[PDB]
Design a protein around this nucleic acid. Structure first.
Ligand SMILES: [K+]
Ligand SMILES: [K+]
Ligand SMILES: [K+]
Ligand SMILES: [K+]
Ligand SMILES: [K+]
Ligand SMILES: [K+]
Ligand SMILES: [K+]
Ligand SMILES: [Mg+2]
Ligand SMILES: [Mg+2]
Ligand SMILES: [Mg+2]
Ligand SMILES: [Mg+2]
Ligand SMILES: [Mg+2]
Ligand SMILES: [Mg+2]
Ligand SMILES: [Mg+2]
Ligand SMILES: [Mg+2]
Ligand SMILES: [Mg+2]
Ligand SMILES: [Mg+2]
Ligand SMILES: [Mg+2]
Ligand SMILES: [Mg+2]
Ligand SMILES: [Mg+2]
Ligand SMILES: [Mg+2]
Ligand SMILES: [Mg+2]
Ligand SMILES: [Mg+2]
Ligand SMILES: [Mg+2]
Ligand SMILES: [Mg+2]
Ligand SMILES: [Mg+2]
Ligand SMILES: [Mg+2]
Ligand SMILES: [Mg+2]
Ligand SMILES: [Mg+2]
Ligand SMILES: [Mg+2]
Ligand SMILES: [Mg+2]
Ligand SMILES: [Mg+2]
Ligand SMILES: [Mg+2]
Ligand SMILES: [Mg+2]
Ligand SMILES: [Mg+2]
Ligand SMILES: [Mg+2]
Ligand SMILES: [Mg+2]
Ligand SMILES: [Mg+2]
Ligand SMILES: [Mg+2]
Ligand SMILES: [Mg+2]
Ligand SMILES: [Mg+2]
Ligand SMILES: [Mg+2]
Ligand SMILES: [Mg+2]
Ligand SMILES: [Mg+2]
Ligand SMILES: [Mg+2]
Ligand SMILES: [Mg+2]
Ligand SMILES: [Mg+2]
Ligand SMILES: [Mg+2]
Ligand SMILES: [Mg+2]
Ligand SMILES: [Mg+2]
Ligand SMILES: [Mg+2]
Ligand SMILES: [Mg+2]
Ligand SMILES: [Mg+2]
Ligand code: NA
Ligand code: NA
Ligand code: NA
Ligand code: NA
Ligand SMILES: [Zn+2]
Lengths: 48, 127, 97, 57
RNA sequence: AUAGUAUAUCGGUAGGGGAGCAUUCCAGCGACGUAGAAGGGAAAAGGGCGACUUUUUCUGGAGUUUCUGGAAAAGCAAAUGUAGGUAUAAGUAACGAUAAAGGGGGCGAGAACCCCCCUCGCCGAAAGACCAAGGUUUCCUGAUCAACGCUAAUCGGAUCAGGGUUAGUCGGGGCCUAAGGAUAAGCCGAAUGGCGAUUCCGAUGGAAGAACCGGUUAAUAUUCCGGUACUGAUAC
RNA sequence: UGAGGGUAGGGGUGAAAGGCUAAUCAAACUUGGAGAUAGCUCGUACUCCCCGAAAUGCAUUUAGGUGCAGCCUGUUGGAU
RNA sequence: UACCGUGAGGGAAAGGUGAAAAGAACCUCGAAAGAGGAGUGCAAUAGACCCUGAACCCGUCUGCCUACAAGCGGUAGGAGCGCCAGGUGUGACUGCGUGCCUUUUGCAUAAUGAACCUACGAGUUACUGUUUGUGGCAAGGUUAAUUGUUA
RNA sequence: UAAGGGCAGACGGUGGAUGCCUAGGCUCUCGGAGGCGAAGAAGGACGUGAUAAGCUGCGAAAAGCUGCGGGAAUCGGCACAUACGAAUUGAUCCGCAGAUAUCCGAAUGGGGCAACCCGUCAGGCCCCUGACACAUGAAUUCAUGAGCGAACGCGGGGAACUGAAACAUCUCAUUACCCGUAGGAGAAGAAAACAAAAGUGAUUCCCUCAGUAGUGGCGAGCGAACGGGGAU
């Protein structure tokens, strides 16, 4: 059967990528929380 | 302070009169191996080698090569080739060794554990 | 600074080789140990690469080694004096090496 | 369908009374002198019932 | 408990009261320990009663402790209680489409399963061939069989090392714009901001710049080589 | 049927089944307020000694909760 | 961090050889894995998952009992046998005996709960009162913030 | 008698408790300090070794370059082995000042799916490649700002569960949370003030006053000031 995750690299970066996070105040708020935690992976732009 | 040196000296002097061989960490289940140990316990070594060679259990081939070693240890510690009809299996035991855990999937997303067991085998020979 | 160095002649003051003198061969600064010639031999088991057991000096912790007096043959503590600084033997007062 | 209780050590060991490895039916080879299974060709010499059966190189 | 040995009294849930033991650490006076401390195994003996204590011996190989007072992370049998380990059911269910296997050689300690050969069987609008998405070295070769492979394995999409992807034209990108997105001038609005062009971005579409057949490697091939073409720039 | 866009939680979307909104829907998920509240259920660990109940009355948005009385116990003073 | 999730986010386990690698040359059995020796070392039953090394759970050996026997598995008696001077292991035969916890008027209950072991796990502290045991001062008792000296 | 079983002991297996230990935590005291960034930050990507996965350091000058002060025989990081070298003409190492410092990121020449693509302008080499500049907004070419980051401050907005043994006033609470913006602190601050014929004179903070005067479906609750003693 068709499952929930059907990958598309173009969709992934448009929805969760680094440049989309930086485009809004609430996205930059997410980046600040992940930096303060010390995450090695900041966005999906890192795993690529 | 020499106490453990004196305890160990007596331990080594007794080992000169004991003829044995060991198998450690054999990657097969101890219960199946025990089935083979009960077959050759207290039996003349020449007859046991043939019994192990033509056994239908797979654990017997490993045990056959350990009995050969036990006999050779006997001749090293006694300084003569063993006769025929002379030695016999005076002691044998199988102990469970450490277990390797694995995973086998089951229906509806559940997972079960598989145990891949091991064992140790020790054989004594005697005239 | 260390109270001994390569080329020094030192006497062992503790351990099984106490009362024995000898020359310093190598100094392991980080571990604070040194090789003294002819003392603390070991039987190392080497595979061919013809093989066999071979002899080598094992290092002794440097706090068990004292510089031998220039004049007398006994081990002494040392100091440094400006007469740059230079080592000298506390038992006799003469400069060392 | 389900065990109401775990079995004690005694009950488990009593059931395992009849779990025995079967001994081979062995015979000595009149030619080689080696052990072989009765009614089979000796794998060492190749002989069977006094005659050569598997001439082994 | 009363009287100072005598009289009485001593079954107990909820519950009230009294008196103690062990544990960790601190102060003080002091002890023990490589001629063997703590911990762990065995044995013996004690206590108005008990919580507990003491001694001997084996292991162990460096810390331990009496008494008086002080302070608490100060005691488990059960919470469908938590972690780690090990049992029972049990050598039981099961080993994942009923397309199918048999023989002879080979390497090898070892072969139902690996390699070669003969026969048999299954798919064949596919279970064959070429791309896209996605994956990211799984591709080829040598060595290895611990783990992985629902068996074994000399084999493998497994482990380690080495090697392997070649473009003027192919596919992209460079050019163009759609949905939508970001904006300019402006408009709106506690803040954060929301809107807003013919502007820009953005292919899944449009391009007036153009290549196809064959052969070679263990692994690449409109890319390398052969043959035969085409398209921009640039200099005379 | 492929690619890329858009609508976001009392909101969306619905040829309307309270269907669907990442195996979750009569109000998604994540973190925080937060150890919400639970007159309810379950659980509550060393020792010995002395004493030892109640399951009634009244009141209560009260009835399997609670307040006061009644009945237990410590200390203290009186005799009753 | 690994791992889980489209994402926001969630989020582990895992310390110790020995004073010193002196980290086991060489031989024997094995195709080699594994062991027996040798050697190093205070010690290898310190040999790499290595200090100590408990329980549940699992083996081998020795002693006694057990194939006419029927219930929470013990308890109180009691021969024989085996070991080391009256202690210890076993237990023929006999009497009595329906686990434990919790919840209940009342549970062997066919009401609840637990596979077992080791480890973890639940009336604590602060402040303000009140009663009481023990003390200081007493017709009086007591300082708070803070200040001085010393260190 | 024992196919088997029961109990006890001896010796082992497994497992990793306990004892001992520490390399890391926890709570504080005293002193200092309280930022970094367009001269490009925080945080990253990619590289960098005789050998080189990963960390560490560093940036195409890439485990590093140059001076000054210190110091004295070893050194080429964790970190081995092998290999080649450095150094008493002073190596490594420490303190201070310099040199170099790719790409992304406020990111700022334009775009963009972060670490990429595409330009104009002036110079120099030769289809390409060097080395400059080129955002926007608020002031007068010039000067400035932007972004990031503990808590404490001041502003703009602002819940509910909960308590009231129900609940709407009330409470939780001018809290959580969201947003803006300073400083080493900030805010306040020099009487159109308190007091009561007696007086004190800016602000802030501590001890009292006091659970008092009051307030309140006069319920649950909430709760001063004057005056006095201090710090300054
Ligand atoms: K202790
Ligand atoms: K191969
Ligand atoms: K909602
Ligand atoms: K053990
Ligand atoms: K009988
Ligand atoms: K029931
Ligand atoms: K740019
Ligand atoms: Mg196995
Ligand atoms: Mg077989
Ligand atoms: Mg599935
Ligand atoms: Mg059976
Ligand atoms: Mg009585
Ligand atoms: Mg009583
Ligand atoms: Mg259950
Ligand atoms: Mg069955
Ligand atoms: Mg069956
Ligand atoms: Mg199945
Ligand atoms: Mg079956
Ligand atoms: Mg199959
Ligand atoms: Mg196909
Ligand atoms: Mg392949
Ligand atoms: Mg296999
Ligand atoms: Mg391969
Ligand atoms: Mg093209
Ligand atoms: Mg355009
Ligand atoms: Mg190919
Ligand atoms: Mg071709
Ligand atoms: Mg309906
Ligand atoms: Mg769903
Ligand atoms: Mg709701
Ligand atoms: Mg709250
Ligand atoms: Mg709660
Ligand atoms: Mg009574
Ligand atoms: Mg009720
Ligand atoms: Mg009452
Ligand atoms: Mg030991
Ligand atoms: Mg150990
Ligand atoms: Mg009868
Ligand atoms: Mg009932
Ligand atoms: Mg009752
Ligand atoms: Mg009853
Ligand atoms: Mg029953
Ligand atoms: Mg119930
Ligand atoms: Mg149950
Ligand atoms: Mg029950
Ligand atoms: Mg229990
Ligand atoms: Mg339990
Ligand atoms: Mg044991
Ligand atoms: Mg421990
Ligand atoms: Mg210098
Ligand atoms: Mg209420
Ligand atoms: Mg500032
Ligand atoms: Mg100030
Ligand atoms: Na001892
Ligand atoms: Na416990
Ligand atoms: Na028996
Ligand atoms: Na440069
Ligand atoms: Zn034969």
């Amino acid at each position: 059967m068709k499952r929930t995750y059907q990958p598309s690299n173009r969709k992934r970066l448009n929805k969760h990528g680094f440049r989309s996070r930086m485009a809004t105040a609430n996205g930059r708020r997410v980046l600040a929380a992940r930096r303060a935690k010390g995450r090695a992976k900041l966005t999906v732009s890192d795993e690529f | 302070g020499a106490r453990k040196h004196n305890s160990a000296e007596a331990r080594k002097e007794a080992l000169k009169q004991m003829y044995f061989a060991k198998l450690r960490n054999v990657p097969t289940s101890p219960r199946k191996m025990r089935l083979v140990a009960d077959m050759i316990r207290g039996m003349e070594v020449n007859r046991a080698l043939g019994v192990l060679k033509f056994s239908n259990k797979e654990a017997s081939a490993r045990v056959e090569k350990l009995l050969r070693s036990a006999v050779a240890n006997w001749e090293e510690k006694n300084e003569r080739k063993a006769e025929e009809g002379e030695l016999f299996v005076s002691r044998i035991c199988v102990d469970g060794a450490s277990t390797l855990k694995r995973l086998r999937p089951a229906p509806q997303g559940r997972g079960y554990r598989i145990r891949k067991r091991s064992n140790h085998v020790t054989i004594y020979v005697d005239t | 600074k260390l109270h001994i160095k390569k080329g020094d002649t030192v006497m062992v003051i503790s351990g099984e080789d106490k009362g024995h003198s000898g020359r310093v061969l190598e100094v392991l600064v980080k571990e604070q140990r040194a090789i003294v010639e002819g003392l603390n031999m070991i039987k190392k088991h080497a595979k061919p690469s013809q093989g066999g057991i071979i002899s080598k000096e094992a290092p002794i912790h440097i706090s068990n080694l004292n510089v031998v007096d220039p004049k007398t043959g006994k081990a002494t503590r040392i100091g440094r004096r400006l007469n740059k600084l230079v080592r000298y033997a506390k038992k006799s007062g003469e400069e060392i090496k | 369908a389900h065990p109401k209780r775990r079995q004690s050590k005694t009950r488990t060991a009593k059931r395992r009374t009849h779990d025995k490895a079967v001994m081979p039916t062995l015979a000595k080879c009149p030619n080689c002198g080696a052990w072989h299974i009765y009614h089979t060709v000796c794998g060492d010499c190749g002989y069977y019932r006094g005659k050569l059966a598997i001439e082994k190189e």
